[PDB]
Amino acid sequence: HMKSKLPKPVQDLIKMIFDVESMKKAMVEYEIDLQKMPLGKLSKRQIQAAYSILSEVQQAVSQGSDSQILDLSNRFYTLIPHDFGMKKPPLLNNADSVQAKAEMLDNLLDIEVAYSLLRGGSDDSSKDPIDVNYEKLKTDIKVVDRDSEEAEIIRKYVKNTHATTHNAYDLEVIDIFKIEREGECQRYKPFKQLHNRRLLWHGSRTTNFAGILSQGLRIAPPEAPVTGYMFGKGIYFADMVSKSANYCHTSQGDPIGLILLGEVALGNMYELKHASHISKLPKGKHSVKGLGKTTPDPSANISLDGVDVPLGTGISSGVNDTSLLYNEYIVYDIAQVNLKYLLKLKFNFKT
Numbered sequence: 342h343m344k345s346k347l348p349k350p351v352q353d354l355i356k357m358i359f360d361v362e363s364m365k366k367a368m369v370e371y372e373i374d375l376q377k378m379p380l381g382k383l384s385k386r387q388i389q390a391a392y393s394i395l396s397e398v399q400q401a402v403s404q405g406s407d408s409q410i411l412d413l414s415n416r417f418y419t420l421i422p423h424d425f426g427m428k429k430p431p432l433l434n435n436a437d438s439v440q441a442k443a444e445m446l447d448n449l450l451d452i453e454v455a456y457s458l459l460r461g462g463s464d465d466s467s468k469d470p471i472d473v474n475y476e477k478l479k480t481d482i483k484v485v486d487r488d489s490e491e492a493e494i495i496r497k498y499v500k501n502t503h504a505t506t507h508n509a510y511d512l513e514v515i516d517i518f519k520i521e522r523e524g525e526c527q528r529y530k531p532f533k534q535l536h537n538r539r540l541l542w543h544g545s546r547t548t549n550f551a552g553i554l555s556q557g558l559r560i561a562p563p564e565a566p567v568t569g570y571m572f573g574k575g576i577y578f579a580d581m582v583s584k585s586a587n588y589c590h591t592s593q594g595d596p597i598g599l600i601l602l603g604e605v606a607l608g609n610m611y612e613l614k615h616a617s618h619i620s621k622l623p624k625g626k627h628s629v630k631g632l633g634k635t636t637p638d639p640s641a642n643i644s645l646d647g648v649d650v651p652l653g654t655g656i657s658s659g660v661n662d663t664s665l666l667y668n669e670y671i672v673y674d675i676a677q678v679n680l681k682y683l684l685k686l687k688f689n690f691k692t
């Protein structure tokens with residue numbers, strides 16, 4: 342092929358995010374039987390069906406037996422086949438089982454999106470598949486320059502917002518990308534001047550990123566158990582990098598991961614200290630803020646292109662009986678997000 346004029350870091354990202362082996366590795370992390378549910382047989386409507394049964398299991402857990410649960414648990418396993426041999430699989434009987442399986446389903450939705458891009462489209466060997474797969478993302482991706490001012494600001498956000506309680510690892514920023522999803526800026530125009538616009542982190546495993554870049558960040562579908570997510574079905578962001586970095590699910594067997602910096606239009610925040618599973622905000626509120634014990638120093642806020650960047654080192658927030666060690670941010674309409682950056686990070690595990 343003609344060999345691709347994309348910059349090296351961008352070609353590496355495309356390799357990373359369309360890796361079919363990482364998709365399969367992720368599936369077997371979730372205990373899915375690839376003999377019975379291979380990558381190419383994944384489909385939205387099976388994932389959707391599974392979501393509803395999970396919501397049934399949610400229903401039975403909300404209202405309390407271990408015999409009247411069994412059937413609901415088993416129906417779940419009927420829809421997404423797991424790998425337990427001649428088995429009896431573990432019973433899905435508690436709220437943690439519901440969270441776990443809804444996190445998995447999230448991730449299969451995204452893997453299905455990624456694979457259907459690979460398997461939709463045309464086949465032309467004289468083009469570089471790197472270039473081809475780049476187009477499938479409908480996203481402009483540029484390398485940000487190590488000496489630029491935006492790079493300085495970003496690396497400082499990373500440097501100052503790593504929580505002491507996440508010191509099992511640290512982070513090097515390998516590459517910084519400026520990104521522009523096709524049509525997102527149009528989607529965002531209603532919110533482009535809203536008060537309380539913040540630049541914030543969103544972490545995800547790297548197998549989600551083709552989906553994230555083609556579709557944007559999304560809300561979990563109506564079928565999904567709202568109980569599966571602490572503040573219900575929104576898009577979750579953090580102001581401490583390590584908090585969002587933990588959701589990369591990197592480790593000593595895959596130390597490289599990807600994290601986002603989106604501009605998020607929070608406006609009038611509904612502030613909450615504990616788990617609250619809602620599907621609409623109260624009238625007048627635009628977002629939820631889960632109140633952390635620690636917060637970036639509000640005195641060190643700093644503007645990058647007229648959007649506040651909360652990059653001060655963590656101080657006490659003043660909040661007393663909160664469930665959350667760190668702030669957390671949720672919006673319930675996808676048009677309130679404009680993705681701006683993507684970092685590739687190297688995690689040094691000190692263990």
Ligand SMILES: NC(=O)c1cccc2[nH]c(C(=O)N3CCNCC3)nc12
Nearest residue numbers: 444542543544577578579585588669
């Ligand atoms: N994705 C994040 O970086 C993130 C940041 C702050 C709070 C969060 N809470 C969650 C969260 O629990 N999720 C659960 C299932 N997948 C969507 C994300 N993710 C985050």
